[PDB]
Amino acid sequence: SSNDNIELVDFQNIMFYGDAEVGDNQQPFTFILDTGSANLWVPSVKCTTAGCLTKHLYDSSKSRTYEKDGTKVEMNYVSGTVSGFFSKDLVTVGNLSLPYKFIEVIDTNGFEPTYTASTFDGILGLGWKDLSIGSVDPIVVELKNQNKIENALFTFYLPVHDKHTGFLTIGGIEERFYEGPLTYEKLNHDLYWQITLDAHVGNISLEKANCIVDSGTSAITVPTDFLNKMLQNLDVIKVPFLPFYVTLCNNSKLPTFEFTSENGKYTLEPEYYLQHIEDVGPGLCMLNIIGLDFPVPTFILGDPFMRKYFTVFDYDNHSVGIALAKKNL
Numbered sequence: 511s512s513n514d515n516i517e518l519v520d521f522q523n524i525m526f527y528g529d530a531e532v533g534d535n536q537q538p539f540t541f542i543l544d545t546g547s548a549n550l551w552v553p554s555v556k557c558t559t560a561g562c563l564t565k566h567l568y569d570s571s572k573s574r575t576y577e578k579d580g581t582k583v584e585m586n587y588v589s590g591t592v593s594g595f596f597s598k599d600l601v602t603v604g605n606l607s608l609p610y611k612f613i614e615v616i617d618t619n620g621f622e623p624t625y626t627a628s629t630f631d632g633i634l635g636l637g638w639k640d641l642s643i644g645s646v647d648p649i650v651v652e653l654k655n656q657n658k659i660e661n662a663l664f665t666f667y668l669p670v671h672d673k674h675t676g677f678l679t680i681g682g683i684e685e686r687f688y689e690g691p692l693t694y695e696k697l698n699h700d701l702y703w704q705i706t707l708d709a710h711v712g713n714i715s716l717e718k719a720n721c722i723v724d725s726g727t728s729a730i731t732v733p734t735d736f737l738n739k740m741l742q743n744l745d746v747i748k749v750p751f752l753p754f755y756v757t758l759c760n761n762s763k764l765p766t767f768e769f770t771s772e773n774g775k776y777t778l779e780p781e782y783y784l785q786h787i788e789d790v791g792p793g794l795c796m797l798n799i800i801g802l803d804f805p806v807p808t809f810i811l812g813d814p815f816m817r818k819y820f821t822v823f824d825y826d827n828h829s830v831g832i833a834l835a836k837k838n839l
């Protein structure tokens with residue numbers, strides 16, 4: 511066995527976070543563990559924007575293993591931008607440490623008011639090297655190269671609000687987390703943890719849709735066209751301007767998403783994508799789904815999918831393994 515287990519903390523089934531440390535003195539930070547990006551960044555002690563106010567800040571002068579870099583970086587997410595410079599220091603994830611190149615952030619104006627209203631300190635990417643700024647080798651690939659872990663893979667057992675905690679597990683697959691078979695789907699590219707699946711909901715079908723398995727997206731994203739076709743007559747209301755689709759929690763017309771390959775069929779019933787339950791007035795629910803268009807039809811299988819399905823991210827075999835997550839630990 512062995513394996514490096516990092517506990518995940520849930521925030522109302524919307525978000526979940528995990529802790530890691532930087533510096534030979536292991537200064538603590540709370541992170542978004544993101545399979546959809548490939549850089550680690552923590553706010554520096556030299557950051558004075560309002561966002562930086564409530565955060566755990568990184569002080570390089572307090573760490574002997576720190577190595578100066580200074581190369582300026584502007585980190586642009588779809589969610590916002592943070593800027594700073596590269597630095598090298600010891601990074602500690604679970605019970606493992608390694609020297610690592612990260613971004614020391616000094617300006618978060620372009621990420622406010624989001625950052626100001628966040629509990630996390632930084633973001634820790636878990637994608638492929640080519641998805642990174644600075645050509646940074648993935649943390650997991652490094653640990654493997656350094657013989658600290660059994661395999662160059664990590665798995666996500668997402669926490670379920672109310673029922674249980676989760677775990678980011680580095681180095682090997684633990685059966686304690688799933689039931690039934692674990693089916694692998696080959697990555698179509700070494701960038702995002704993206705695989706090809708046929709997407710189906712009700713009548714609509716999108717053959718060989720690119721699907722990004724993203725721990726960092728808190729919703730299921732659907733191409734707008736496909737989304738337009740499925741909402742016809744469903745008793746699902748869109749609040750204009752805003753990305754909210756609301757519906758009665760008991761709307762019997764709600765469809766099950768179906769993602770299929772010749773290896774497995776993964777579904778997402780209404781109970782997995784309806785947020786709310788006993789809300790404003792009667793039983794209004796919002797769908798944790800939004801429309802989003804990429805150059806080629808893409809689905810982002812974000813947290814709602816991962817909460818149902820245990821996922822394995824395998825660098826050695828360039829694939830994503832999917833299994834039904836055990837309901838409770």
Ligand SMILES: Cc1cccc(C)c1OCC(=O)N[C@@H](Cc1ccccc1)[C@@H](O)C[C@H](CC(C)C)NC(=O)c1ccc(N)cc1
Binds near residue numbers: 547590643722
């Ligand atoms: C939270 C949330 C809710 C609904 C929908 C979405 C999309 C979402 O997520 C918002 C978000 O920005 N998510 C990212 C992680 C994140 C989460 C919260 C706050 C900031 C970032 C990350 O998971 C996903 C994106 C790419 C996909 C949209 C294709 N990454 C980059 O932008 C990126 C940047 C630089 C790179 N070199 C590589 C990638």
